[PDB]
Amino acid sequence: CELYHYQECVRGTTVILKEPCPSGTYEGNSPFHPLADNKFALTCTSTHFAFACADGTRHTYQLRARSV
Fold this sequence. Notes:
By secondary structure, this protein is an all-beta fold. The chain has one domain: Sandwich (Immunoglobulin-like), CATH 2.60.40.1550. Helices cover 0% and strands 59% of the residues. It has strands spanning 2-10, 14-18, 25-28, 34-35, 39-43, 47-52, 58-66. It has a 4-stranded mixed beta sheet with strand order 1-7-6-3, with no helix packed on it. The radius of gyration is 12 Å and the shape is globular. One of its GO terms (biological process) is symbiont-mediated-mediated suppression of host tetherin activity. It is a single-pass membrane protein; Single-pass type I membrane protein. It is found in: Virion; Host endoplasmic reticulum membrane; Host endoplasmic reticulum-Golgi intermediate compartment membrane; Host Golgi apparatus membrane. Interacts with the spike glycoprotein. Interacts with M protein. Interacts with E protein. Interacts with the ORF3a protein. Interacts with human SGT. Interacts with host ITGAL. Interacts with host BST2.
Protein backbone atom coordinates (compact mmCIF):
# COMPACT_ATOMS: atom_id res chain seq x y z
CA CYS A 1 0.00 0.00 0.00
CA GLU A 2 3.12 2.19 0.14
CA LEU A 3 5.09 2.99 -3.01
CA TYR A 4 8.12 5.24 -3.17
CA HIS A 5 9.26 7.28 -6.14
CA TYR A 6 12.60 9.06 -6.58
CA GLN A 7 13.91 11.16 -9.41
CA GLU A 8 16.40 13.90 -10.04
CA CYS A 9 15.72 17.08 -11.97
CA VAL A 10 17.59 20.27 -12.81
CA ARG A 11 16.91 22.89 -10.14
CA GLY A 12 14.71 25.74 -11.28
CA THR A 13 13.29 23.91 -14.30
CA THR A 14 9.70 22.72 -14.62
CA VAL A 15 9.00 19.02 -14.13
CA ILE A 16 6.00 17.29 -15.67
CA LEU A 17 4.77 14.12 -14.00
CA LYS A 18 1.88 11.73 -14.52
CA GLU A 19 -0.53 11.35 -11.61
CA PRO A 20 -0.05 7.89 -10.06
CA CYS A 21 -3.81 7.37 -9.96
CA PRO A 22 -7.04 9.04 -11.11
CA SER A 23 -8.43 11.78 -8.83
CA GLY A 24 -6.02 11.02 -6.01
CA THR A 25 -5.47 13.39 -3.09
CA TYR A 26 -2.17 15.27 -2.97
CA GLU A 27 -0.11 16.72 -0.14
CA GLY A 28 3.25 18.44 -0.51
CA ASN A 29 5.45 21.50 0.04
CA SER A 30 4.34 23.25 -3.14
CA PRO A 31 0.86 24.06 -4.50
CA PHE A 32 -0.57 21.54 -6.94
CA HIS A 33 -0.48 22.50 -10.62
CA PRO A 34 -2.91 20.19 -12.42
CA LEU A 35 -2.55 19.78 -16.18
CA ALA A 36 -4.39 17.91 -18.91
CA ASP A 37 -3.99 14.17 -19.49
CA ASN A 38 -3.75 13.14 -15.83
CA LYS A 39 -0.53 15.12 -15.34
CA PHE A 40 0.83 17.81 -13.02
CA ALA A 41 3.67 20.31 -13.03
CA LEU A 42 6.04 21.54 -10.35
CA THR A 43 9.19 23.61 -10.12
CA CYS A 44 12.20 21.43 -9.49
CA THR A 45 13.52 21.70 -5.91
CA SER A 46 14.64 19.05 -3.42
CA THR A 47 11.30 18.13 -1.91
CA HIS A 48 8.82 15.39 -1.00
CA PHE A 49 5.11 15.06 -1.78
CA ALA A 50 2.51 12.33 -1.70
CA PHE A 51 -0.70 11.06 -3.26
CA ALA A 52 -3.39 9.02 -1.53
CA CYS A 53 -5.30 6.81 -3.97
CA ALA A 54 -8.76 5.25 -3.87
CA ASP A 55 -7.24 1.76 -3.95
CA GLY A 56 -5.49 2.46 -0.65
CA THR A 57 -2.06 2.93 -2.20
CA ARG A 58 -0.05 5.93 -1.05
CA HIS A 59 2.71 7.18 -3.32
CA THR A 60 5.51 9.22 -1.78
CA TYR A 61 7.72 11.15 -4.17
CA GLN A 62 11.17 12.55 -3.56
CA LEU A 63 12.68 15.00 -6.03
CA ARG A 64 16.42 15.60 -5.85
CA ALA A 65 17.27 19.01 -7.28
CA ARG A 66 20.69 19.23 -8.90
CA SER A 67 22.70 21.93 -10.65
CA VAL A 68 23.56 22.19 -14.36
